[PDB]
Design a protein around this ligand. Structure first.
Ligand SMILES: Nc1nc2c(ncn2[C@@H]2O[C@H](COP(=O)(O)O)[C@@H](O)[C@H]2O)c(=O)[nH]1
Ligand SMILES: Nc1nc2c(ncn2[C@@H]2O[C@H](COP(=O)(O)O)[C@@H](O)[C@H]2O)c(=O)[nH]1
Ligand SMILES: [Mg+2]
Lengths: 202, 207
């Protein structure tokens, strides 16, 4: 019942999504862990317009841990040092990238944590984003697969009902998906991907 | 001419390099340009063992050139980055760490020489700031390794240390290759054509 995804499939999924993602006009990309790292790079190829610079990709890791005497908390295993990076989130379009939305908890908390970063950086400079909305950080999400299961966590209604804020390359059935970069036998992996129709689908 | 490289070819190139990269024992992997992202993440999969932590991967721009819009579908395009745009980005904790620098191709070697020099300066500056003498406590040194998919058989415009190059456990080229233009699959805007050409030229599966 495992679904095998080939590299060529992923490439195409990023290719067909790039057009609607350009409407979001991302200023930077934040790729979650090992899953978002490659999708983010492939997107970047199709986001590059003649004349405008190659946008930065930032790699983060979120580790979730359970109740501890109202919610599941997060440790920032790998984060952005905005000080040494010289990265202002204020007034930017930020695209969060991962491979799969499963229960939606990782994306929910990644967004929550990054919204915290954005607000704290704006209040440090004395900016009220509700009085001046042009300096507000605009978050978008790109994912390859959004599993059609019931979610354990939510995303903002405004972002979730907008096709120019939330970008899921393909809404897929509730199955375990094997991504090509996770494979130690890529020949077998690709054979299965072609056989299952998870390859070169156009 | 133009040599098309498939994704599956890249995967296997990382596959045959992973066991010797284990001898270097990297604490982190740094992709220094667009060509290092895919190799860096595939490596992580092959470096994983039970009872061993997952290696961290970072992308830090230390590239001298770029190629994204320019494809002949001229082909052999290397455009230097304009200094009009400040590309002095993020910093990493390098002290006491084994660092694998990853890129796709060693061409004239200017990029790797530059990246190595910059990263070596960062580490030295971090060590001095913390009050560390890396000569008195050498475990605080930063050891650098380089992994590249392709290393071109041609003159080099910049040098890497001879002792590093001579050491198969410090300079890792998956394949030493003739001076041609390599089309990498993450650069393709027509992956069907790209893969088909790669298969025709024997640049797909080889294991
Ligand atoms: N390889 C793989 N990982 C998955 C899959 N579903 C969830 N995950 C893991 O769980 C994360 C998303 O889980 P969520 O937070 O949405 O429940 C992903 O980033 C990934 O690490 C899957 O189908 N295949
Ligand atoms: N796609 C592609 N890029 C190349 C090739 N040779 C050099 N480059 C570009 O130039 C960089 C290497 O620069 P050098 O080694 O000359 O300092 C690579 O990271 C890549 O951006 C090639 O054969 N194919
Ligand atoms: Mg490069």
């Amino acid at each position: 019942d495992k679904q095998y995804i080939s590299y060529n499939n992923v490439h195409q999924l990023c290719q067909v999504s790039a057009e609607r993602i350009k409407n979001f006009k991302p200023d930077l990309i934040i790729a979650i862990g090992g899953g978002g790292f490659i999708p983010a790079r492939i997107l970047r190829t199709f986001l590059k317009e003649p004349g405008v610079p190659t946008i930065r990709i930032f790699a983060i890791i979120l580790s979730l841990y359970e109740d501890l005497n109202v919610g599941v908390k997060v440790s920032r295993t790998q984060w952005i040092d905005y000080e040494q990076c010289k990265l202002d989130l204020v007034g930017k379009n930020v695209l969060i990238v991962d491979e799969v939305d499963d229960t939606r908890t990782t994306l929910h908390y990644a967004l929550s944590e990054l919204e915290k970063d954005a607000a704290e950086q704006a209040k440090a400079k004395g900016i009220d984003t509700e009085k001046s909305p042009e300096m507000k950080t605009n978050f978008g999400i790109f994912v390859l697969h959004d599993k059609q299961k019931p979610k354990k966590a939510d995303l903002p209604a405004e972002m979730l009902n907008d096709k120019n804020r939330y970008f899921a390359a393909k809404t897929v059935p509730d199955k375990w998906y094997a991504y090509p970069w996770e494979s130690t036998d890529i020949v077998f992996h690709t054979r299965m991907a072609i056989e299952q129709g998870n390859d070169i689908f156009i």
